[PDB]
Each structure stands twice: as C-alpha cells, then as structure tokens.
Amino acid sequence: MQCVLAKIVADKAIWVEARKQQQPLASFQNEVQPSTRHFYDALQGARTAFILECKKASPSKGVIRDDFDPARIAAIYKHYASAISVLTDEKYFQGSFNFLPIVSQIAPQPILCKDFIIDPYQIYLARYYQADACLLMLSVLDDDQYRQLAAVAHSLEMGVLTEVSNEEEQERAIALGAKVVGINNRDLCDLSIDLNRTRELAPKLGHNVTVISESGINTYAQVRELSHFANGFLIGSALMAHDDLHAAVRRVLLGENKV
C-alpha cells in the first residue's frame, strides 16, 4: 500500500487536533517550567551510553509486553540507563503522555518522549508531563520545520534526538548542526531492518555530535560490534519482550548471564 510511517503521521495530525481541541496550549502553556535534567550531557563520554525504552507494542511486532507497567520498568531501567525513552503514541505503540511523569519520578535519568513530533504543541505538551527531551525526525520534517521545532524544545530546556535514515538525511542533520543524531536501523516504510545503516551513516558525523544507534539491537554481540560506530544505543524490544526485565538487561546490555 504505502509507507507505514506515512499512515502514522496522518493519524498523528488527526490526534493532536482531537487533543488540541481538548487540552489547548493556553490551558497549561506558561505553566511548564524548563527541563531540570540534561539529556545532551547524559549521553556524553567515551563509555557506551544506553537509552532504554518503555514500549508496549509496535507496528512491527504487535503487542510486546503483554503485562505493561511503566512503574516496574523504570524501577529497573534506572540502575543502568543514561536516558529513558517513552513512546507517548497510543494508536501504534499503546503509549501515553501520562507514562512520562510516571517514569520521571521513579527514574532520575533524563526522560525522552518518543513520538512523531510534527507540532510545537506536542513539544509543549510533553514538557508539561516532564519530558526532558524529544525526538525530531528529518524524514517527517524539512529544515524550516526542524529549526522551528528545534528552537521550541531549546526554549524549554529540552534535548533533541535527531533521527536520520539515509545519507541525505545525515548530511541534513549535519547542515542543521544537530547535536545528537539517532541513526534508525529500521526502514519505517516496510519496517525492514539493516544495522549497516549505523555503520554507514556514523563515520562522517564528527565530534560534538553524539551518535545513537536505534532499533534492531537484539544481542550483546551486536551491541559490542556496533559500539565501534555509535556512542550509544536505544533498545526497546530486546528488553520489553522479557518478563524478568533485570535478567534481560544483564544478557543484552552486559553480555552477562554468560549469554
């Protein structure tokens, strides 16, 4: 039919309205204080940085965590994460803006709102729920849109994870002087995965640009090999797909449990 990300944005627009009508910016605007946490800093260092994600379901795998509970998840993700990602999209990943606060309190790491942001309202909306940073996608926006949204987040003391999926987007994120570039291994059109994208698009990125490899990381071996190309990883399913969540972090992130 058509790209999956395409369908998603359609619904994201129809979603903000059904909520902009309900909870307009004015009904909370000048009441959202900047973020008292630093996303950008949290990902700095020579040590592999981890962005653990709380996700319940996805277009690619359906329902992942049959028994979701953003409370118990952050209770574990907090002992290891550099940052914690939270899908705030209900229709596709069964996420919810309320999960953000639920975590920002149980976990001290900067919270990242993982959603398809196409409206400044959304940024204002997440900051309201304690979202310490947001995700802007160069495959869903264009320079002007990005600058706009980029400026907005940088107003509320919020970090910006810039997602690139190809060389053109990479070159763009560079021209835009993006500070944290997330390279997505998943082709959001057909939902196919290729970890070489990380290998391909990171070498050029130069310093003062933290590279985060996102999606498809299933094993520790992959973490270890790809740590040669990226500064960090954003891992969702490899963790959410297991009941014993702590044992999962040991296997996948620490190459523990002796495999």
Ligand X SMILES: O=C(O)c1ccccc1NC[C@@H](O)[C@H](O)[C@H](O)COP(=O)(O)O
Q: Which residues bind ligand X (CB under 6 A)?
A: 4-5, 53, 55, 58-60, 114, 188, 191, 214-217, 234-238
User: Which entry of 104, 165, 184, 213 is annotated as an active-site residue?
Assistant: 184
Looking at the Cβ atoms of 164 and 238, the one nearer to ligand X is 238
CB closer to ligand X, 82 vs 237 = 237
- For residue 17, indicate whether it is catalytic: no
Give yes or no: 12 in active site: no
Q: Is 214 an annotated catalytic residue?
A: yes
Own/partner long-range contacts of 254-258 (Cβ < 8 Å, ≥24 apart): 254/220, 255/220, 255/221, 255/223, 255/224
By beta-carbon proximity to ligand X, the closer residue of 59 and 101 is: 59
* Residue 169 bears catalytic tag: no
* CB 79, min distance to ligand X, A: 19
Q: Which of 180, 196, 187 is closest to 234 using CA atoms?
A: 180
Q: Find the shortest distance in angstroms from Cβ 21 to ligand X.
A: 25
Q: Is 200 a catalytic residue?
A: no
Half-sphere exposure of 24 (CA within 13 A, CB side): 3
User: What's the CA dihedral at 183, 109, 39, 91 to 10 degrees?
Assistant: 50
Query: What residues are annotated to the active site?
Result: 53, 55, 114, 163, 184, 214-215
